[PDB]
Design an enzyme around this catalytic site. Structure first.
Site, PDB file in Angstrom:
ATOM      1  CG  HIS A  80       7.250   1.704  -0.417  1.00 26.22           C
ATOM      2  ND1 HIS A  80       7.575   1.393  -1.837  1.00 26.22           N
ATOM      3  CD2 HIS A  80       6.016   1.479  -0.163  1.00 26.22           C
ATOM      4  CE1 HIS A  80       6.601   0.914  -2.283  1.00 26.22           C
ATOM      5  NE2 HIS A  80       5.483   0.839  -1.510  1.00 26.22           N
ATOM      6  CG  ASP A  82       2.895  -1.255   1.599  1.00 29.78           C
ATOM      7  OD1 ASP A  82       3.415  -0.853   0.683  1.00 29.78           O
ATOM      8  OD2 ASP A  82       2.304  -2.586   1.726  1.00 29.78           O
ATOM      9  CG  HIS A 209       6.504  -3.714  -1.592  1.00 32.34           C
ATOM     10  ND1 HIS A 209       6.191  -3.309  -0.215  1.00 32.34           N
ATOM     11  CD2 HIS A 209       5.638  -3.088  -2.457  1.00 32.34           C
ATOM     12  CE1 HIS A 209       5.226  -2.511  -0.634  1.00 32.34           C
ATOM     13  NE2 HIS A 209       4.682  -2.533  -1.528  1.00 32.34           N
ATOM     14  NE  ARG A 224      -1.913  -1.985  -2.090  1.00 36.11           N
ATOM     15  CZ  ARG A 224      -1.912  -0.617  -2.310  1.00 36.11           C
ATOM     16  NH1 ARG A 224      -3.233  -0.184  -1.892  1.00 36.11           N
ATOM     17  NH2 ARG A 224      -1.207  -0.047  -2.801  1.00 36.11           N
TER      18      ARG A 224
END
Lengths: 244, 254, 254, 244
Positions: A80, A82, A209, A224
Site C-alpha cells: 500500500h 500510505d 511498502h 513513526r
C-alpha cells in the site's frame, strides 16, 4: 555535498553512512538527504541509538510538516501507499526501530516510478489515462502521478484501490493485477531487516511498502513521524478529488 | 553438536557462523549442517574466501553425490554468469536434485540478490480442505524434451514434511481444463511466493548458500544491469519423489 | 401422465406443449410440471395468451406459496421493465426462493433473451477431488443489508442432486484470503456458465418460463437498447439450504 | 433491393427469408446478401433442403473463391477460423445435414461490437497490440483489424492466439482475458439451434464462433465451404506477417 550513499537493491533503496540524524542538521545535509530520498525512494540510517522520541520529531520537522507532539508508536502485510484514500496523502514517513525481532519482521518497499517506466509504451499510455477510486473516505486519484519535485511518473495503486473508474469489475481487476504486478515484481523492491536504532525514510509519492508478518509473538515496536503531502497531479494536469 | 546458527527470516533461512567449509569437515559438523539444512531450508556461510573450485567440489561430496560444460579443473562445478522466475531445480526429470551448493565469485555492488521460498511452510498454511485437494493433484513438468508427472505434494524423505512441488516447469495440473489448471496453480504457487514464506539474500564474494531443493523454490533478482555477477554451483543427486498416498513420480516423455 | 416435453439444449431446458396454464389445472398436470421442472431445471410454455395477471398469480399458487409495489389487481406479481449478471435469486437470505414463474408481456423484436445455467450439471462435471473440495466450502452472500452463509454445494430437497450455489451475490468464500477466494470462485462459477450447461431463450409475448432456483442461475441479456421489454414474475418461497454434511445455511447480518 | 431480414439477437445475427440459395441467384440478390453479411456478421437461411453438395459449392463461388471444396464435420472453443495463417478466410457457408434433436448449437460473437464497446483508452491500447497466432504455422496479426469493406474495427483474437507480442506471459494473459472477455460477453453473441437444411454464413473478419458440445452421441453432420480472405490491415495500416 556528497553523502556516503550505499545503494541496497539495484532499482531502489540506499543506506546513508556518517550521518547522525537530529534537529540540528545543517541545510546542505538536509538537502542532500532530500535528494537521496527522491533518487532512491527509500533510505536507511543505521545506529541512530542517540535518536530519542523528541529528537526524531525535531529531525522530521526539518523535512516537512508532521501530520512528544507527533511521534506514533506501532507495536500491515499488504502492499500500500500510505493513506491514499485522502486527497493530499503523506509525502513521507520517518520510521525508527525501537524493538526488533531477532528473526523476521522485515519491511519491503517497491519503487512505483520504476514500475511505471518498465511498462511497454502502449501500456504506459493507457495507465496515463486511468483513474482509480481509493477507499478506507473515497478519493479519485490518477493511476499515474507526476512527482512534484522530480517530474518522474509513478503508479499510484496498492490496497486502498477499490476499483478503476469506468470499467467493469472484471476488467478493473485485470488492469489492476497487471499494473500492481509490476509494482511488486521482485526487481522493483528492497527488503530491509531491522536492528534497533535503524531509521528508514521513504517517499510515499513513489513507493508502496509491506510489513512482513513472519515473526509470531516476537515483540516489534517502531516509532513513526508522517510528513504532510500535496494533492497528486496526473499527466494531463488534472488533480485528485475526494468524492465521499 | 550445536553450530552457531542465526535465522535470517522468520520462516526460512539461517546463517551458520564459525564454520570454514572444506573437504575435511568432521562427521559431527557435516551432520549438524545436514540437520540445519532440513530445518531452515536454505543456509548461508559468509567469508568462505579460502574455498576454491576444487575445495567446493570436495566439500560437496561430503553432502551427497554431485551430478554430471564445467569449470576447468573440476568434474561437477557449473558457472552461472538470467533466471528471474520461481522454480524448483530440474523438476522436469524424475529424480531431480536434492540440493545445490552455490558460491559467489563476483557479486554486484548493488542488486543481484537470490530469494528462496519454503514450500513446506506454504503447504502447511493452506486451509485443511485445500491441503486435502493439493494431496490429490499431479502436475506435468516439462523443459519445453522431457515431461515428468509429479504429485503436487511431496513427502520429504528425511523430515516427512509435506511440501508443494510446483514452480515454472509446471506445464499443467493433470485432469483439469486449462483455465482450471491456471487458477489452481495460481492459488498454490501464490502461497509459495507469499513474502512471509521467503528469504532474500544479498551476496558478497565468498558467500556460499546451500538449499534443500525438495522443499524450496528460488528466484534470482535481475536488477543489476551490466554489473558482472558470477556464481559457481554444485548440484547433488536426489530421489524419486513420493506423494502422500505413497505413489512415485514417473517420466512420461523422452 | 406424460406431458408433451421437448428438450431445448442438451443439458438444460424443455418446452412443454399442449398445456394451457391456469389456476384450474388438475393435480396430475401440476405434478407432471413439477417433475419436469426438477428434471430440466427451466421449462417453457409458449402461446399463453389467455394468461393474465390474476390467472398467472392463481396458477402460481398451485406450485408453491408466492412471496410478498406489485402489479395493480394482484398481491404478488412483480413487473420488470436491467440484470445482465449471473445469479441465483435472493441468495443473500437464508430461505431464498425455490422458483419463479415469468411471463413475457412485451418482447423486443430483436434481443432481450434470458439464459439459465444448470448448477447441478456444473457440480457433476467437476473432477472428483474438486467436487470434494466444493462439498466443504461455504460462501458469504450479501446484497452489497443482509449477509448469509451458504454451503457452496446444496443438496436439492426433492431430487437429492447436488448443485453449486454461487453467482453474483457471493461476497467471498469463507476461510480464504481474498486472492484464493477469487480463484476458487472463478473456477467453480466458470463451470456454471460454460456454454454447454446453459440454455438461452428468445422471448415472444405470451411465453412463460418457470425455473428451479435451487439448481440454476440466470442472466438477462442487455442487447436490446431502448426496445421496450416487460415481463411479470411471481416468486415462490423456498427452504433453508442443506449442505452435503447436513449443515444449514445461516444469516449472519440483518 | 430489400431482402426479408429478421435480426435474431440485438447486436448480431439475422435470418433472411424468401431466398432459395443456389448457383443461379442474380447480382442484386448476391449483393444484398453480401451487405446483410457485413451488417449482421452472421446470417441464416432456413429450409434450404433443395441445396445439395454441388449446389452449395456453386452458390458459394458467387460470394468469393472457395479454398472439390466441401468439408463434412469437436470445436467447443471460441475462435476465428484459421487465424494462424496470414490471409485467413473471409467467410464460411455452413449447411446442417443432420441435426441433433437436442443440443448441437453454434454461437457467434461480434468482434466489431466487442471493440466498439471498450472505453476509449482501452481501444487505443488494443489499436497498438499485435498477437502471435499458431496452430500449435505462426503468424503475427494486429489485435485490431480494420474491415476491408466496411472500415469497422474488430478484435482479432480467439483460441489460436499464443501470446500478445511484447508482454510478459502474465500481462499477455491478463490483456487477452480483458479483450477476449468482451468478445464472448453474452450481449455480443447469437446462439443458433440448427434444423436440417439450415445454412449459416458468417463474416470471419468480424466474428468468432463456438460449437456447443452438449449432444452426446446424437449424430450431427454439417458441410462447409470456406472462402479465401485478404491479408489483415491494422489501424496504422500495417499488414499481418507469417513468421514461422
Amino acid at each position: 555535498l556528497e553523502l556516503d550513499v550505499h545503494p541496497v537493491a539495484g532499482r531502489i533503496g540506499a543506506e546513508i553512512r556518517g550521518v547522525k540524524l537530529s534537529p540540528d542538521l545543517d541545510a546542505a545535509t538536509v538537502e542532500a538527504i532530500q535528494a537521496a530520498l527522491v533518487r532512491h525512494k527509500v533510505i536507511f540510517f543505521r545506529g541512530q541509538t542517540h535518536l530519542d522520541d523528541q529528537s526524531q520529531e525535531g529531525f522530521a520537522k526539518l523535512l516537512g510538516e508532521p501530520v512528544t507532539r507527533y511521534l506514533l508508536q506501532l507495536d500491515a502485510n499488504s502492499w500500500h501507499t500510505d493513506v491514499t484514500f485522502v486527497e493530499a496523502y503523506p509525502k513521507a514517513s520517518i520510521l525508527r526501530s525501537v524493538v526488533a525481532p531477532a528473526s523476521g519482521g522485515d519491511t519491503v518497499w517497491a519503487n512505483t516510478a520504476a514500475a511505471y517506466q518498465e511498462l511497454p509504451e502502449p501500456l504506459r499510455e493507457l495507465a496515463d489515462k486511468l483513474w482509480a477510486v481509493h477507499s478506507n473516505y473515497e478519493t479519485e486519484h490518477p493511476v499515474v502521478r507526476v512527482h512534484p519535485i522530480s517530474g518522474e511518473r509513478a503508479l499510484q495503486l496498492g490496497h486502498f484501490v477499490k476499483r478503476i473508474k469506468g470499467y467493469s469489475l472484471a476488467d478493473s481487476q485485470h488492469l489492476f493485477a497487471v499494473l500492481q504486478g509490476h509494482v511488486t515484481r521482485l526487481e522493483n523492491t528492497v527488503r530491509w531487516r531491522w536492528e534497533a536504532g535503524d531509521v528508514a525514510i521513504w517517499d510515499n509519492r513513489a513507493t508502496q511498502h509491506y510489513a512482513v508478518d513472519d515473526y509470531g509473538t516476537q515483540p516489534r515496536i517502531v516509532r513513526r513521524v508522517t510528513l504532510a503531502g500535496e494533492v497528486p497531479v496526473g499527466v494531463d494536469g488534472q488533480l485528485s478529488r475526494t468524492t465521499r
